[PDB]
Design an enzyme around this catalytic site. Structure first.
Site, PDB file in Angstrom:
ATOM      1  N   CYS A 161      -5.381   1.259   8.582  1.00 49.67           N
ATOM      2  CA  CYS A 161      -5.335   2.334   9.532  1.00 49.67           C
ATOM      3  C   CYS A 161      -5.522   3.790   9.129  1.00 49.67           C
ATOM      4  O   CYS A 161      -5.636   4.728  10.038  1.00 49.67           O
ATOM      5  CB  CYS A 161      -4.013   2.120  10.301  1.00 49.67           C
ATOM      6  SG  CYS A 161      -3.272   0.607  10.602  1.00 49.67           S
ATOM      7  N   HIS A 295       0.999   8.948  14.398  1.00 48.77           N
ATOM      8  CA  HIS A 295       0.335   7.546  14.051  1.00 48.77           C
ATOM      9  C   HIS A 295       0.823   6.738  15.228  1.00 48.77           C
ATOM     10  O   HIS A 295      -0.149   6.031  15.794  1.00 48.77           O
ATOM     11  CB  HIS A 295       0.828   7.012  12.852  1.00 48.77           C
ATOM     12  CG  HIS A 295       0.114   5.561  12.516  1.00 48.77           C
ATOM     13  ND1 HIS A 295      -0.978   5.464  12.366  1.00 48.77           N
ATOM     14  CD2 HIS A 295       1.144   4.400  12.335  1.00 48.77           C
ATOM     15  CE1 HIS A 295      -1.117   3.999  12.090  1.00 48.77           C
ATOM     16  NE2 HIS A 295       0.023   3.645  12.230  1.00 48.77           N
ATOM     17  N   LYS A 325      -2.618   7.196  20.888  1.00 49.24           N
ATOM     18  CA  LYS A 325      -2.954   5.840  21.086  1.00 49.24           C
ATOM     19  C   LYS A 325      -2.259   5.085  22.371  1.00 49.24           C
ATOM     20  O   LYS A 325      -2.820   4.084  22.610  1.00 49.24           O
ATOM     21  CB  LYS A 325      -2.201   5.052  19.840  1.00 49.24           C
ATOM     22  CG  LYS A 325      -2.960   5.321  18.732  1.00 49.24           C
ATOM     23  CD  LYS A 325      -2.473   4.213  17.560  1.00 49.24           C
ATOM     24  CE  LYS A 325      -3.350   4.523  16.183  1.00 49.24           C
ATOM     25  NZ  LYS A 325      -2.882   5.647  15.431  1.00 49.24           N
ATOM     26  N   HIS A 330      -5.397   1.304  19.417  1.00 47.52           N
ATOM     27  CA  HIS A 330      -5.431   1.370  17.817  1.00 47.52           C
ATOM     28  C   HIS A 330      -6.750   1.044  17.297  1.00 47.52           C
ATOM     29  O   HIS A 330      -7.226   0.101  17.415  1.00 47.52           O
ATOM     30  CB  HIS A 330      -4.343   0.721  17.369  1.00 47.52           C
ATOM     31  CG  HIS A 330      -4.047   0.917  15.773  1.00 47.52           C
ATOM     32  ND1 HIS A 330      -5.162   1.745  15.086  1.00 47.52           N
ATOM     33  CD2 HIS A 330      -3.293   0.550  14.961  1.00 47.52           C
ATOM     34  CE1 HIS A 330      -4.461   1.733  13.938  1.00 47.52           C
ATOM     35  NE2 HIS A 330      -3.561   1.024  13.706  1.00 47.52           N
ATOM     36  N   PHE A 387      -0.960   6.155   9.121  1.00 52.98           N
ATOM     37  CA  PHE A 387      -0.182   5.155   8.237  1.00 52.98           C
ATOM     38  C   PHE A 387      -0.909   3.775   8.168  1.00 52.98           C
ATOM     39  O   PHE A 387      -0.853   3.316   9.200  1.00 52.98           O
ATOM     40  CB  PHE A 387       1.304   5.110   8.337  1.00 52.98           C
ATOM     41  CG  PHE A 387       1.799   6.792   8.732  1.00 52.98           C
ATOM     42  CD1 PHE A 387       1.528   7.848   7.544  1.00 52.98           C
ATOM     43  CD2 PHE A 387       2.771   6.787   9.424  1.00 52.98           C
ATOM     44  CE1 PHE A 387       2.145   9.042   7.753  1.00 52.98           C
ATOM     45  CE2 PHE A 387       3.306   8.163   9.622  1.00 52.98           C
ATOM     46  CZ  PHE A 387       2.991   9.261   8.773  1.00 52.98           C
ATOM     47  N   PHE A 389      -1.302  -0.437   6.434  1.00 53.33           N
ATOM     48  CA  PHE A 389      -0.771  -1.763   5.653  1.00 53.33           C
ATOM     49  C   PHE A 389      -0.894  -1.152   4.539  1.00 53.33           C
ATOM     50  O   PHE A 389      -2.071  -0.641   3.933  1.00 53.33           O
ATOM     51  CB  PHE A 389      -1.502  -2.915   6.146  1.00 53.33           C
ATOM     52  CG  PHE A 389      -1.141  -3.272   7.548  1.00 53.33           C
ATOM     53  CD1 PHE A 389      -0.152  -2.946   8.386  1.00 53.33           C
ATOM     54  CD2 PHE A 389      -1.829  -4.507   7.967  1.00 53.33           C
ATOM     55  CE1 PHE A 389       0.105  -3.290   9.509  1.00 53.33           C
ATOM     56  CE2 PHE A 389      -1.572  -4.941   8.857  1.00 53.33           C
ATOM     57  CZ  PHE A 389      -0.585  -4.509   9.992  1.00 53.33           C
TER      58      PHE A 389
END
Lengths: 404, 404
Positions: A161, A295, A325, A330, A387, A389
């Site tokens: 992301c 985020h 978002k 996303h 941010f 994974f």
């Protein structure tokens, strides 16, 4: 050290096919989320998406399109927009000092499926010769560099992301090192059942609001239940300041801060502690932040860790905060650049977009200024967080350029 | 400007599972290529591979392995080797000033196939929760950053066959900008029929030597017929020179040059012109290049364009040249770091590895010094070229560090 500015922007997102449509959607707080028949047909539990209301194959020549999945296609259209917006000459687009850094979180899950199905049923010779550029991790940079005749750097950054935010940050660094005068930076993401299915399989997606798609993405709401998947493309023209001024460029803003850190903690959940370091690094030598585009994906844990990080960094009388978002979903590899664009449009046009769908505000947001209605005002400095994974964090800080 | 050195190396390749094995293979001119029953069973025309003779599940715990495809797994084992080689404890490994830049050309085609087959047969709920980190384009960085507790930068660079060379270059840049003191850099690539199939579909792979696998990869030979696919992992510890010296680090060499350019020409064939610029950009004032490890994949067009570029850069005064791919095959995302490691071993141990399988030398190589037998000699400066689809070029130049 060289200063770096944004001089052109292009976008395909769930809320618009170009800057003018996106801008209208941001001001109205208009949702880009709809029901997905495709997802329902494949038996997915999440049946909502931030779909792209465009057919790229209608706007791109076969000669280019043959090498592209939708990630590259959306990014290609975005780059065409940004180059026109910037007023770049052909000699500036194709130049030893002009490069591209642009990536995707995935690449082309759709073409992998097609190629494998085709090979199993019809044989390797009927797969055709175009699948490597469609499916490889560098698809977005590769498919754009070739037809735009890019001569400078050419590669993709990936970081889930955070992908397209690190692409922009890396561009800034190339310019600061003196290696390029212009870098086209951004990203793209296809939207397809097979990629989505893997997020559904891990429980990351919204599933409780399929009957009311525009209400599913609801960052900071007490009843949030995962993100709504989207995609698209975005590109920005990142340019050395003197070079921009000498050619009479439009300057949307100066990138005054870039943070990149790593949590070192969990593959899927953010620590909070990495985001603190990331924001602080991006704020080094920055006087004051007016607005933070968070985020904010509409997940239970994620939303809270980021708010805690913001509170720790800023203390009291925090900047204004919104999560776009909630409107867009996303966009994964394209999320960083989409939100840099949204934030830059807010900066340039003097407004803050609302954080929509908050019926009950989470307690973690106490003592923060969560913006829930369009707010029209001059902004001087904005911050955008991404941010991903693997515990990867990027923050960008963009300030008005005012002749000083 | 800060100087940058290599202080640790780790590798899993077709010619060895660690540096000691790889070194032996390089000196012996030993092929890592074997027949692939898997490729035959799937009806592929190329049935040879540079396979990895290792079982990663023996050496990685389930807790880490659950998130990994083979690209991440090979890179993980390489990182463990490089950390040991560099003499680092968990304190230097997990540090705000220590980061990771490591990627893959693909990601996990294998896990995409598995997840889709499972979902179609059994439903989304039986796919399980680990498929996104396995398949996402940042898998290599993400799967390493979390268990090694990396706190600095964390992302993947992708650029097809150039992938891990740009990863190294970017690490050097992060150090030169003062952002990090140590960056772990490299890459990984899985070896699986579904990825290979897409190359076979475009006619890129060797098919005429399936009966004699060790003869299939034959860079510069008149009867070359495409590359032999491989994979694996590699990592190097890239470190700021004063930091290395202050802790008494063993130094393998100094990275004195990094070039990154783009052809802007053809999606699959190199232009030659981009590689000229790339080599020159990497030649940061060096006295003399002693040896070039060429990109040299064993393709008809590719081999020739690179030789013409070398002639344009060096005129009549060519360095010694060899293509280690004739022994190893083409490790794709891992090729750059593998060949940086091979070249560094040649620099450190004082030898040039032979370019094997040349029965009839191509007329494009006339008046170049193609090395076909092991040559033992002091080297001061080496160069390694990596050129990828999308016209993307990376060159690294590594010089001996001898106290100045």
């Amino acid at each position: 050290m060289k200063r770096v500015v944004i001089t052109g922007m292009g976008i395909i997102s769930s809320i618009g096919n170009n800057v003018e449509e996106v801008l209208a959607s941001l001001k109205a707080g208009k949702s880009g989320i709809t029901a997905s028949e495709q997802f329902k047909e494949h038996g997915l539990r999440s049946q909502v998406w931030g779909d792209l209301k465009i057919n790229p194959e209608e706007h791109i020549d076969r000669k280019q399109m043959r090498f592209m999945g939708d990630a590259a296609a959306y990014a290609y259209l975005s780059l065409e927009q940004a180059i026109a917006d910037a007023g770049l000459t052909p000699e500036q687009v194709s130049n030893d000092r002009t490069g591209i850094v642009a990536g995707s979180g995935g690449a082309s899950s759709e073409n992998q499926v097609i190629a494998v199905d085709t090979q199993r049923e019809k044989g390797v010779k009927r797969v055709g010769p175009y699948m490597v550029p469609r499916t490889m991790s560098s698809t977005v940079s590769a498919c754009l560099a070739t037809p735009f005749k890019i001569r400078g750097v050419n590669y993709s950054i990936s970081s889930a992301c955070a992908t397209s935010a690190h692409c922009i940050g890396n561009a800034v660094e190339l310019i600061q090192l003196g290696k390029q005068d212009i870098v086209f930076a951004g990203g793209g993401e296809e939207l397809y059942w097979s990629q989505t299915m893997m997020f559904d399989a891990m429980g990351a997606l919204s599933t409780k609001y399929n009957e009311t798609p525009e209400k599913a993405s609801r960052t900071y709401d007490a009843d949030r239940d995962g993100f709504v998947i989207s995609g698209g493309g975005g590109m920005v023209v990142v340019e050395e300041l003197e070079h921009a001024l000498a050619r009479g460029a439009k300057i949307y803003g100066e990138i005054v801060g870039y943070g990149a850190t790593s949590d070192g903690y969990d593959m899927v959940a953010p620590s909070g502690e990495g985001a603190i370091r990331c924001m602080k690094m991006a704020m080094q030598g920055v006087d004051k932040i007016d607005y933070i585009n968070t985020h904010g994906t509409s997940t239970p844990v994620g939303d809270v860790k980021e708010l805690g990080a913001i509170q720790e960094v800023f203390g009291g009388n925090s900047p204004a905060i919104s999560a776009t978002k909630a409107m867009t979903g996303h966009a994964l590899g394209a999320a960083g650049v989409h939100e840099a664009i949204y934030s830059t449009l807010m900066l340039h046009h003097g407004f803050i977009a609302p954080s929509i769908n908050i019926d009950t505000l989470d307690e973690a947001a106490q003592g923060l200024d969560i913006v829930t209605e369009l707010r029209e005002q001059e902004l001087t400095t904005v911050m955008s967080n991404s941010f991903g994974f693997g515990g990867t964090n990027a923050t960008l800080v963009i300030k008005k350029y005012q002749g000083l």
